[PDB]
Amino acid sequence: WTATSGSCKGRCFELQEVGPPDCRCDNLCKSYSSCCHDFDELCLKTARGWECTKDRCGEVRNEENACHCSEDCLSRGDCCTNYQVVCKGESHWVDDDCEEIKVPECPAGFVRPPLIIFSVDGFRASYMKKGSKVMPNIEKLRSCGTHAPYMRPVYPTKTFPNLYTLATGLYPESHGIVGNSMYDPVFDASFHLRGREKFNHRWWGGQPLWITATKQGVRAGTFFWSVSIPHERRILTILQWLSLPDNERPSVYAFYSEQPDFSGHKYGPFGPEMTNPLREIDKTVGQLMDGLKQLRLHRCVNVIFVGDHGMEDVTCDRTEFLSNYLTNVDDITLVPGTLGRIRAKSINNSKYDPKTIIAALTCKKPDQHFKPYMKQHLPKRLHYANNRRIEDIHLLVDRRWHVARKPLDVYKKCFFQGDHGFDNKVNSMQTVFVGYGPTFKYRTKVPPFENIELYNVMCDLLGLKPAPNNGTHGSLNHLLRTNTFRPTMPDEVSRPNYPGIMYLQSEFDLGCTCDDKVENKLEELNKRLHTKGSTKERHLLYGRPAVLYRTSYDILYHTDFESGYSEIFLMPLWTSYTISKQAEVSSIPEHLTNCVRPDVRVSPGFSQNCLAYKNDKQMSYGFLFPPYLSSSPEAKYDAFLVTNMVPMYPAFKRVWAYFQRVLVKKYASERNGVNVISGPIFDYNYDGLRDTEDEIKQYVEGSSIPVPTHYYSIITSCLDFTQPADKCDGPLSVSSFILPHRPDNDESCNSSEDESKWVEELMKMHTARVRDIEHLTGLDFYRKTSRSYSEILTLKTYLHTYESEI
C-alpha cells in the first residue's frame, strides 16, 4: 500500500528517496508504483520536442516544454542540448577538433572533475569499427580519449551479473548476483527479471560505487532508471543535476541504454536493422556532450563509455534439449539459455544422483553443443562456483547455441536472432571501453582488460578508497593521466630455509627403488656449485616467488631447476626452470624408469614415500621438472629426487606427460625460450583461494601426502621474441593454465586418441591469469625484474585467450 497524495511540485528527480507511503518523485518511483500523481505531469514534460528550432530561439519561457530556448534557460539549467548551437551559433561538440585536455578546466565550485558512467547494454566490441561511420560522437570519444580494443566481461555474460560487477569490482560468485535468473536455497526464493524480488537488498553484496562514494562523503547520482523514462529526459536530468548548487550537486552520475541489446536480440548482432539503434546512442552521446559544452563542463568531466557484454548469432533451431539426453527430465529443474544450471526439483528427493546426471550428459552425441561440469571443475578463470545460488551442475554452452529442458519449453513456453551469456573468452561476447576526460590520456590505446578492474579506476577518479574487491589496484594506471594509487609489492611473510646435505641414504625408508650407483675433481666441484646456485639466475629469471602466508619451506637448488619445497605439504609449491630454444628433449632410459631417489637435503620425515603410491591403485606420481628436459644424462638423476615428486592420477598423467614432453619444447621454439614455473594447487572449497592444512580433504592413501586439485604453470618469455627468454631486457610475455587434477578425462571427448589431438585444446580451455594462481597458491611472482611494478601488475592480469582477431 502507498498513499501517493503528496505532490512532486519541486521534488522533480529528487536525489534522496522518501519513506513510504509519502509518494516519491525520484527516477525510480515508477518501478515501485509509487510516483506522485503529478509526476507524469510535472517531471515527464514533452512539448516542442527535444531540440531548439531556429524560431524557438529566445522565446518566452513556457514552463511545460521539455526544454527551453528562452534567454534564461542556460542559467536555469533546463536548456535543450542544442540551444547554444542553433540559437547562439555555436558548433556541436563532435564538429570540434579534439584538444588535449592537459589540466582539468572546471567552473568554480567544482572541487573535483565529476564522473559520468555511460553504460550501453549489449554493445559488442567490434561495433566500434564496423559502426564508426554512423557514430561520429562515439568515434571522437574513442579516438581522442583512451580506449581498449575490447573489454572482457565476466561469466555469465548476462546483464545483471555484469552491471553489478562493474559497480563492485567483484565476481558474481562474490556479489551474489550470479544470473538474471537465480533460485536461492536458503531464502527459498527465486530472483527473476520480471517481478519484485530483485529489489530486496538481500541479493546484493559488496559495496557498489554509489555506496562507496556516499560512505566517504561524495554525493552520488542515482544509477538505475525506470524503463519508462526516455533517454533524452535522462540526459536533461543529468545536466540538470550538474546545475545544482555546489553542496547539493552529485560527483558521480550514471546513464543506461537498453540498446543495442534490445535490437540485437531481435535482429542478431549485425542484422541490417542494427544500424539505426546504433545511431540513437551516438545521437544521445552527442546530446550529453553538447550539454556539457553548454555548461563549460566538457573539458572537466570524465566520461566512461562502456558495455556489459556483446551479442552473438543465436536461433531457436540451434537448441539442444535435455529430453534427448535423459529420461526423468521432470525430476530436475534447469536454468536454461546460453548456459545451463541444473538442480533437483525437490530436496525431498534423496534419490537424486548427480553423478548419473552428469554421466548421461557426457560425450553422448558426436557433435554435442554443450558440456556438463560439476561447478568445482569449471575453468578457474570463470570464478563461478563459490556461491550457493550457483547449482552444482553447470552446462557450458557452445557459442551460437542454446540449451533447453524439453521441446515444449521452446515453441509454446521461433522469434529471436541473438542472445548472450556464453563463456567470457568468446569473441562475440567482448564489450567496449573508452575513457574521455582530463584524468584520462590523450589518443591512447590500451590492451584489453577484464571488467572487474573498473571499480578501482572509478574510485581513483573520484578520490575514493576502494572497498575490498577482486581487481588488482594499479593494474590500470597505464590508462590514467595521474594516479591516486602507487601500488606496492606485498611483503614476504615466510622466509625460506636453504638446507645443505644433512642425511645419509640409510636413514631413509621410503621404499624407493633406483639404479644410479655408478660414478673426479673437475665436476665433483661443479655439481656442488649447482646445489649452491651457480645456475640460479638461469632458471629463476624474475626472482624467487614470495610466500605470502606462514609456513616452513626450503629452497632446493639443482643444475636445471630450482624449487621451493614445503615441509608441510611434502612437495614443492613451485619449481622454476628455463628451456632455451636450443634445448633438447630426451627419453627416460630403461634402467631409470621407476627411479625415485631420496633427497639427502630433506628429512625422511619431511619426504614422501614410494610405498603409499604402490599401495594406492588410484594414485600414481609425477615430476615437476620434467626428466625429458634434463641438460645432461648426469643431471637427469636430479629430476628423480623424492622432492620433485607430486601425486598424479593415471588419467591426468597422460595430459601432464604430453605437456612436458611435447609442448614445453614447442613453446620454447616459438617464443625463443620459456621460463616455466609449475606446482600444485589445493582448493577443495572452490573459493579460488589457497587451502590450508586443516582443509585437505584428499590424501594419498595411508599417508600424509595431500592430493592437489589442480596443477598450474606460468610460461614467460621475452615479449620481443627476438630476444632469448634468458636475456630479455624489455617487456615480458606470459601465458598460464590451471588444469584440474582429475581421475578421468571425461571432460575431453577425444581422450581415447592421441594426446596430439586433445591435450593442447584442454589447456587452452583452462588458461588463467598469473594473479589467479597467486590467489590459489598464496604466492607472489615477478619480484626481481627491470620492469615497473605497474607494468608487472598488468602482466599478471593478462589472460591468454587463444582466440582469433576481434
Ligand SMILES: *[C@@H]1O[C@H](CO)[C@@H](O[C@@H]2O[C@H](CO)[C@@H](O[C@@H]3O[C@H](CO[C@H]4O[C@H](CO[C@H]5O[C@H](CO)[C@@H](O)[C@H](O)[C@@H]5O)[C@@H](O)[C@H](O[C@H]5O[C@H](CO)[C@@H](O)[C@H](O)[C@@H]5O[C@H]5O[C@H](CO)[C@@H](O)[C@H](O)[C@@H]5O)[C@@H]4O)[C@@H](O)[C@H](O[C@H]4O[C@H](CO)[C@@H](O)[C@H](O)[C@@H]4O[C@H]4O[C@H](CO)[C@@H](O)[C@H](O)[C@@H]4O)[C@@H]3O)[C@H](O)[C@H]2NC(C)=O)[C@H](O)[C@H]1NC(C)=O
Ligand atoms: C574477491 O574479493 C572478495 C572481497 O574482498 C573476496 O571475498 C571476501 O573474502 C573473505 C574471505 O573468504 C570473506 O571474509 C569472511 O567474512 C565472513 C563474514 O563477513 C561478513 O561481513 C561482511 C561485512 O561487510 C562490511 O563491509 C564494509 C567494509 O569494507 C563495512 O563498512 C560494512 O559495514 C560491512 O560491515 C560482508 O561483506 C560479508 O558478506 C557475505 O555474506 C553475505 C550473506 O551472508 C553475502 O550477501 C555477501 O555477498 C558475502 O558473501 C560472500 O562471501 C562468503 C564468504 O564469507 C561466501 O560464502 C558467499 O558465497 C559470498 O561469496 C559477511 O556477511 C567472516 O565470517 C569470515 O571469518 C571467518 O573465517 C575466518 C577464517 O580464519 C576466521 O578467522 C574467522 O574467525 C571466521 O570464522 C568464524 O566463522 C566460521 C564459520 O562461520 C567458524 O567456524 C569460526 O569458528 C568462526 O565463528 C571471513 O573473514 C568475505 O566474506 C568476502 N567478501 C565478499 C565481498 O564476498 C573474495 O575471496 C575474492 N575472490 C578471489 C578469488 O580473489
Ligand SMILES: CS(=O)(=O)c1cc(Cl)cc(COC(=O)N2CCC3(CC2)CN(C(=O)c2ccc4[nH]nnc4c2)C3)c1
Ligand atoms: C555500469 S553501472 O553504472 O555501475 C550500473 C550498475 C547497475 Cl547494477 C545498474 C545500472 C543501471 O541499470 C538499470 O538502470 N537497470 C534497469 C534496466 C535493466 C538493467 C538494470 C535492463 N535490464 C534487463 O532487464 C535486461 C537487459 C538486457 C537483457 N538482455 N537479455 N536479458 C536482458 C534483460 C533491467 C548501471
Ligand SMILES: [Ca+2]
Ligand atoms: Ca545486458
Ligand SMILES: [Ca+2]
Ligand atoms: Ca580454498
Ligand SMILES: [Zn+2]
Ligand atoms: Zn540482452
